[PDB]
Scaffold this motif. Structure first.
Motif, PDB file in Angstrom:
ATOM      1  N   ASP A   1      13.218  -1.002  11.015  1.00 52.85           N
ATOM      2  CA  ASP A   1      12.727   0.321  11.372  1.00 52.85           C
ATOM      3  C   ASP A   1      11.284   0.470  10.891  1.00 52.85           C
ATOM      4  N   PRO A   2      10.357  -0.362  11.383  1.00 53.66           N
ATOM      5  CA  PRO A   2       9.022  -0.430  10.822  1.00 53.66           C
ATOM      6  C   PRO A   2       8.205   0.851  10.961  1.00 53.66           C
ATOM      7  N   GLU A   3       8.518   1.670  11.976  1.00 51.17           N
ATOM      8  CA  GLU A   3       7.719   2.859  12.261  1.00 51.17           C
ATOM      9  C   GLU A   3       8.213   4.069  11.455  1.00 51.17           C
ATOM     10  N   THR A   4       9.314   3.912  10.702  1.00 44.62           N
ATOM     11  CA  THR A   4       9.771   4.971   9.801  1.00 44.62           C
ATOM     12  C   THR A   4       9.127   4.868   8.405  1.00 44.62           C
ATOM     13  N   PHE A   5       8.548   5.997   7.922  1.00 43.32           N
ATOM     14  CA  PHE A   5       8.076   6.192   6.552  1.00 43.32           C
ATOM     15  C   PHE A   5       9.227   6.563   5.626  1.00 43.32           C
TER      16      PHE A   5
ATOM     17  N   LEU B   1       1.406   1.975   0.847  1.00 45.82           N
ATOM     18  CA  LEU B   1       0.452   0.893   1.023  1.00 45.82           C
ATOM     19  C   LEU B   1       0.744   0.200   2.359  1.00 45.82           C
ATOM     20  N   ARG B   2       2.046   0.032   2.621  1.00 44.38           N
ATOM     21  CA  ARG B   2       2.559  -0.610   3.818  1.00 44.38           C
ATOM     22  C   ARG B   2       2.161   0.210   5.045  1.00 44.38           C
ATOM     23  N   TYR B   3       2.451   1.504   5.006  1.00 46.92           N
ATOM     24  CA  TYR B   3       2.394   2.364   6.174  1.00 46.92           C
ATOM     25  C   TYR B   3       0.957   2.836   6.390  1.00 46.92           C
TER      26      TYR B   3
ATOM     27  N   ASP C   1       6.068  -4.904  11.463  1.00 40.61           N
ATOM     28  CA  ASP C   1       6.692  -5.968  12.221  1.00 40.61           C
ATOM     29  C   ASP C   1       8.200  -5.904  12.014  1.00 40.61           C
ATOM     30  N   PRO C   2       9.004  -5.615  13.064  1.00 39.61           N
ATOM     31  CA  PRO C   2      10.456  -5.488  12.937  1.00 39.61           C
ATOM     32  C   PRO C   2      11.191  -6.765  12.503  1.00 39.61           C
ATOM     33  N   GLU C   3      10.534  -7.927  12.605  1.00 41.90           N
ATOM     34  CA  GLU C   3      11.050  -9.184  12.075  1.00 41.90           C
ATOM     35  C   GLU C   3      11.185  -9.124  10.561  1.00 41.90           C
ATOM     36  N   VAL C   4      10.373  -8.287   9.899  1.00 41.27           N
ATOM     37  CA  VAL C   4      10.374  -8.304   8.439  1.00 41.27           C
ATOM     38  C   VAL C   4      10.870  -6.969   7.892  1.00 41.27           C
TER      39      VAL C   4
ATOM     40  N   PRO D   1      -0.678   3.918  14.872  1.00 38.17           N
ATOM     41  CA  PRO D   1      -1.188   2.601  15.232  1.00 38.17           C
ATOM     42  C   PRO D   1      -1.562   2.520  16.701  1.00 38.17           C
ATOM     43  N   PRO D   2      -2.475   1.628  17.137  1.00 42.13           N
ATOM     44  CA  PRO D   2      -2.677   1.450  18.564  1.00 42.13           C
ATOM     45  C   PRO D   2      -1.439   0.803  19.170  1.00 42.13           C
ATOM     46  N   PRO D   3      -0.933   1.284  20.325  1.00 41.35           N
ATOM     47  CA  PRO D   3       0.274   0.706  20.905  1.00 41.35           C
ATOM     48  C   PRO D   3       0.114  -0.759  21.319  1.00 41.35           C
ATOM     49  N   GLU D   4      -1.143  -1.258  21.367  1.00 38.39           N
ATOM     50  CA  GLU D   4      -1.417  -2.640  21.739  1.00 38.39           C
ATOM     51  C   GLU D   4      -0.866  -3.564  20.658  1.00 38.39           C
ATOM     52  N   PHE D   5      -0.595  -3.041  19.463  1.00 41.52           N
ATOM     53  CA  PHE D   5      -0.016  -3.868  18.411  1.00 41.52           C
ATOM     54  C   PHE D   5       1.419  -4.272  18.734  1.00 41.52           C
ATOM     55  N   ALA D   6       2.219  -3.319  19.217  1.00 41.03           N
ATOM     56  CA  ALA D   6       3.637  -3.560  19.401  1.00 41.03           C
ATOM     57  C   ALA D   6       3.830  -4.522  20.566  1.00 41.03           C
TER      58      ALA D   6
END
Ligand code: HEM
Ligand code: HEM
Ligand SMILES: C/C=C(\C)[C@H]1C/C=C/C=C(\C)CC[C@@H](O)[C@@](C)(O)C(=S)/C=C2\N[C@@](C)(C3=N[C@@H](CS3)C(=O)O1)[C@@H](O)S2
Lengths: 380, 386
Positions: free
Chosen positions: A306-310, A259-261, A300-303, A9-14
């Motif tokens: 560990d969002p960046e883990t597959f 689908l998520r990742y 989004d870590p709110e939902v 992902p672009p880091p501008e998202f985080a």
């Protein structure tokens, strides 16, 4: 926005999720919009009735890329009540209980192509031989399209992301081929998807049926191919492919996690607010377009812990990769099924599948918004 | 007898042999002779009697129809076998090609017909019904049933044209080895995928029965038979419909279609001849005794026009009620794909008469050219308009 060499992902998202949830972004067109990245903001943008798609047809409204296509008879550019009428027809067609006459064609096209991979020259490119042709060949069979014309449907779609009049030209062959196809099929007593669409015009206007047919073919080919190439590449690099071989019952959650990742775009069709709307992270003004980034919402870590883990075992996975609300993907059930059977057949026929190069040597498509690997070399 | 004829009309030798010379020698393309049975009662018996052998035609001293080939001389060809082996493979074929399994392939037949009539309907007129419909319909079904990539269809078709027979050469030996090879590779790929097509059912018959060579050759044979025979009969069938105006009868009265299918099978039987039978002792046929070791050709097409069995046998009539024809053969080697074939023909006609009711020959009957060479007869083109 700017080409990345991988599927990171672009880091501008985080950064935007942390402190700039509803800030301007400058799009490839040069125009700007508010970029919604937090889940809850994106959810609201996709479900709320106070946003319009059709307003983006107006000549002053902002665009994502430079050019036309911008069709007034495309489902994605309509609002209620028109929009609602065409969706009622589509629920009547993609009846989750009409899929049953269609599951066999999906499995058969998978078996076909996995067989061809299996006896092909190692190392094989899984994109060219599996992930790109599986969805186009599936859509084509469902539209009663001669297999001799599938390559042509692939190139017209690719052309229609190529320079303006070249994209109008290619849209013109597809629409023309499709209307002709239609004229032929009217009067046969068929039971394919194309037949059910035709018979809904005796609730769909002429131009509606033609353009909907064109869009179903385009929609159900590029996105699925994207997601599947990406999904397989993550399975192979994480070694989670093996998890599915040993525990095939995990395939459903793997599909959801892919689908998520692997959501293929970082962007989304603009929504225009028809008045001032309060989202969870702030108020957005009337006439100020928002881009929903479902890809950002998906990490989004709110939902998602560990969002960046597959993780193919991820149990809680309410991703937005099919969008949400009224424009929610019409082919969602077909796509999810394509993905499941793809993984089922490939892990059964080739359990010892593995990447034939290191991840960092794989090239990704540059431009054209949708992101995906150019090749996925494997061996066994 | 397999010499050039400008049309599909029978050799007039047939009527004379049926009149006064039922079991007389005939010379075949090979140069060799056989007894030619032409009367229905004789052909029936030749096909059903257990006193005739197919396998014995493999012996090096036995008469042949063609001067050299591979696929027909193959010991592992179902047509070149006698009981008990023949019986084993046939029962495998019954457990695959059941009436129920055919009813579970129905949508795929309809779908390929649907596809191709639609492209007929939108074609530049006059459209050649052969290239656009009759040829591709059954090849494309077979290929679908066998999991063959659609890009591989013309390869299968040209190969099958070579093995049927001038276009004759030692090339009908090179073709066999390319089909056999391609098909073996198709099998390799497909084992372990878990699909539900015909080709999967054949593979799951081998695994724990059919030998490797039996599987390979039977799959090749199912592909060739399900295309060339059906293709020819259907083209012939449609051409007679159009030239008689019995096409219209089917449009106005679709319930006639089933009897039309049978009458087409009867009248349009694609061959002058049939696979030699070798009697294994003296056999008394109805028209006379045939000697042990003296081969008989059963002419199913001559039988089908025998006035002893069929009133006005030279008249084409889609309303003629059930009178057993022999276009599928009879007895133990009776065509294994018979029910798929009848179904393909019934749907082709149901679909084509529904979509194009006012179809008509674009040219005069006598202007049409027929395939030269090959053991099958059929028109090169069937041009039509509406
Ligand atoms: C994994 C594959 C797929 C993904 C990721 C996907 C995703 C999406 C998304 C996110 C939207 C909503 C766009 C927005 O609101 O901004 C959408 C709409 C749509 N999808 Fe797809 N799709 C996939 C496969 C398919 C398939 C197989 C079909 C066709 C059968 C299809 C047809 C459509 C149609 C017609 C729309 C527009 C619906 C509307 O605007 O009301 N999708 N798809
Ligand atoms: C109109 C269509 C067809 C005609 C006219 C036809 C005719 C025949 C005839 C007469 C025989 C027996 C020959 C003999 O005993 O000497 C035969 C054998 C056979 N047919 Fe056909 N057939 C047709 C279609 C098909 C189809 C669709 C299949 C494909 C699955 C098929 C597969 C076979 C096989 C495997 C045999 C050999 C059976 C054995 O030797 O026991 N046929 N067919
Ligand atoms: C060409 C026949 C095919 C493809 C199949 C199946 C069943 C057909 C039987 C029919 C239609 C009856 C007539 C047919 O026997 C005849 C005399 O026209 C032919 S075509 C005879 C021969 N053909 C060859 C090429 C083969 N036939 C067998 C094995 S190879 C076959 O595949 O039958 C020669 O052996 S003689």
């Amino acid at each position: 926005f700017t080409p990345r060499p991988d599927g990171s992902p672009p880091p501008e998202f985080a950064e935007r999720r942390a402190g700039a949830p509803l800030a301007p972004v400058t799009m490839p067109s040069g125009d700007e919009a508010t970029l919604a990245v937090r889940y809850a903001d994106v959810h609201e943008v996709l479900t709320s009735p106070d946003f319009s798609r059709a307003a983006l047809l107006a000549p002053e409204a902002p665009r994502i890329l430079p050019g036309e296509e911008e069709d007034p008879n495309a489902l994605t550019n309509m609002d209620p009540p028109r929009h609602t009428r065409i969706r009622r027809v589509l629920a009547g067609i993609f009846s989750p209980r009409h899929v049953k006459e269609w599951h066999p064609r999906v499995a058969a096209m998978t078996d076909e192509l996995v067989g061809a991979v299996a006896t092909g020259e190692r190392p094989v490119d899984l994109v060219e031989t599996f992930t790109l042709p599986l969805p186009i060949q599936i859509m084509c069979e469902l539209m009663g399209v001669p297999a001799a014309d599938r390559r042509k449907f692939q190139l017209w779609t690719d052309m229609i992301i190529f320079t303006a009049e070249e994209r109008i030209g290619a849209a013109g062959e597809f629409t023309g081929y499709v209307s002709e196809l239609i004229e032929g099929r009217r009067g046969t007593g068929g039971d394919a998807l194309i037949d059910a669409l035709i018979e809904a015009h005796e609730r769909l206007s002429e131009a509606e049926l033609v353009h909907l047919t064109v869009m179903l073919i385009m929609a159900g080919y590029e996105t699925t191919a994207g997601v599947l190439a990406r999904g397989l590449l993550t399975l192979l690099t994480t070694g989670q492919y093996r998890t599915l071989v040993e525990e095939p019952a995990v395939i459903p959650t793997a599909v959801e996690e892919i689908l998520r990742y692997e959501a293929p775009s970082d962007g989304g069709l603009l929504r225009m607010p028809t008045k001032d709307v309060r989202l969870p992270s702030g108020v957005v003004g009337e006439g100020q377009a928002v881009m929903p980034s479902m890809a950002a919402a998906n990490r989004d870590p709110e939902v998602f812990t560990d969002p960046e883990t597959f993780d193919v075992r991820r149990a809680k996975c309410p991703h937005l990769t099919f969008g949400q609300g009224a424009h929610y993907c019409a082919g969602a059930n077909l796509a999810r099924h394509e993905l499941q059977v793809a993984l089922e057949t490939l892990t059964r026929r080739l359990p010892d599948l593995r990447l034939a190069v290191e991840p960092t040597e794989i090239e990704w498509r540059k431009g054209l918004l949708l992101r995906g690997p150019l090749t996925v070399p494997v061996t066994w």
